[PDB]
């Protein structure tokens, strides 16, 4: 489950999320979305078919999906989830979750170099 592009974030409109599943052996799969704990109805998102991918012998398949949410819900701190059902999973389902503070940096240094010390170089 992938975070939105920053260009979309710096415009104050709807932002977009992407789900990806790959490497599964029969072409039968289910994708659902969630917001917090509420399942969103399936007229709010677009999901493609399930096609096979170029690989080395053992045939496998892939599928994508997207979902566009409002920037105030993202910036407040509401979380979202993509959920995938397959027959070869032992508990038959998988979840991923994303929000802000996902790829936030760990260190920030700020230096205010005053006057009488300006020593930059070309």
């Amino acid at each position: 489950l992938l975070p939105p592009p920053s260009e979309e974030l710096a415009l104050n409109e709807l932002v977009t999320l992407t789900c990806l599943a790959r490497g599964f052996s029969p072409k039968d799969v289910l994708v659902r979305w969630l917001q917090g704990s509420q399942e969103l109805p399936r007229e709010k998102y677009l999901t493609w078919a399930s096609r096979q991918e170029p690989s080395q012998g053992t045939t496998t398949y892939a599928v994508t999906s997207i979902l566009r949410v409002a920037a105030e819900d993202w910036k407040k701190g509401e979380t979202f989830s993509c959920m995938v059902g397959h027959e070869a999973l032992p508990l038959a389902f998988t979840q991923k979750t994303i929000d802000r503070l996902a790829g936030k940096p760990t260190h920030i240094n700020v230096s205010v170099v005053m006057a009488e010390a300006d020593g930059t170089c070309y």
Binding site: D118, G119, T120, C121, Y122
Partner: protein, 537 residues
Amino acid sequence: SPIFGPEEVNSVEGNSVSITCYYPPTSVNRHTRKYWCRQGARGGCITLISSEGYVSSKYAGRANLTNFPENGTFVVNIAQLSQDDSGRYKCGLGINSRGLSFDVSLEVSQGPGLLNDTKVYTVDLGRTVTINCPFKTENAQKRKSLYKQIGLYPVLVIDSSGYVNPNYTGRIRLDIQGTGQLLFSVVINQLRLSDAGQYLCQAGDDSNSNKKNADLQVLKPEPELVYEDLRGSVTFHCALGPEVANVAKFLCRQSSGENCDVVVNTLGKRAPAFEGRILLNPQDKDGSFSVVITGLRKEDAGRYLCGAHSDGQLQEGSPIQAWQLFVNEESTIPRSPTVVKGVAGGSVAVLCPYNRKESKSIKYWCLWEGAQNGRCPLLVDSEGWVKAQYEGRLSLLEEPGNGTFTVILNQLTSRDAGFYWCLTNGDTLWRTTVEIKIIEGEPNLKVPGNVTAVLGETLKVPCHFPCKFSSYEKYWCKWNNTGCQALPFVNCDENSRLVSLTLNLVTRADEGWYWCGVKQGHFYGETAAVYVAVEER
């Protein structure tokens, strides 16, 4: 960062010096302020002499500073040097607290005083020298030893009867013109850096251990500064003496851990990274040659050494020259395609840039053979000479002009792949190189084979083109030694094909080559070609 000069500078007291710094010749950089400043400790970088008329109190009467705008250089002279002038300095442009500078190091050594009881000889690294020693009229039947005070041991490793060191082997002799008079001598061939120090000569001994000194200085060569830019070219001039005109000479590049890496040899070596873009010329009567390197990348900058040996490698005891190269990279040379693709039967067209204010010159076009040394036979010039086997498939055009000319080569084959150079007769040459790769496919334009003609009647030749060329202009030519210019006889009838040609009486003056082409006004494009003979009946 684009500023360059001599990194280290040495002299002695009382002598003068001359320092040169280089800058890009843009018009901001010629009219701005130039300065020489002493980067001391405790913060500042105090200016000593400037370009606007400032001379300091310590430099009064001793110095000046001259700006040469057409070179892009400026020179600093400092007379009457002392030992308090040793330190770290800076060239520069503009304001000191920015960084358009270059660091220079200057060391001044104490001269000679009241120890002048020796006769010194100076010599280049890898040459001959003599050490004269006056033989006298009684000390013949002793040993003619020669120490060298490694520490303060008297280290006799030379005797004048063959009792030599395995270190100093193969190059020491004596020659007799003594037997009573006051000289004999020893010639030392192929000196090293290791063979410096003070020599306590003798010739026999009368037992007071009476001493004679004769010291030598061996010096490593001073590099010449070369200032070039990105996508340009350089030439070195290797000018050793006529004594080594039958030895194999070479050119390495100094690396970090005392490691030359051979760029060219005379016995046929090359790096892989210089394929297509290097030349080496036959040496003159003085035994002096030149090495040309084009298409300068960023990592080409560094120290270079040219020398001579029997094998073609940097060995100790060989005479060398030096250079230091700087690639500017704030260049004004326009970018160009490096590779140009084509298919068998099709055409190419490459643009070759020169300098705009040198437009009254003659232009050339190479083919880099690269077999033995590196060699540019010409194929076509702007005078009106073409090669023999390139007849009917080569021309040089002065359009678009004003920075660029154009050369067209069609009827391609799989053996036309190679590296090609473009040359002018101007003052400073850029030499640009392009690689022609041959890929698979078929040509866009389509013409028939070679046509005949009956004894005097109308000919008609078609020439097709697809709808990607519908936006463009169509023309023909007849190829001669001075290029080609279009014809009035064409129809261009069909809206998306069939630009024709009509020759309504076949004379003998039409039996040549004809072209069918595409151009966007000034820029040229694809081309096909056919021949038209005339038979007997």
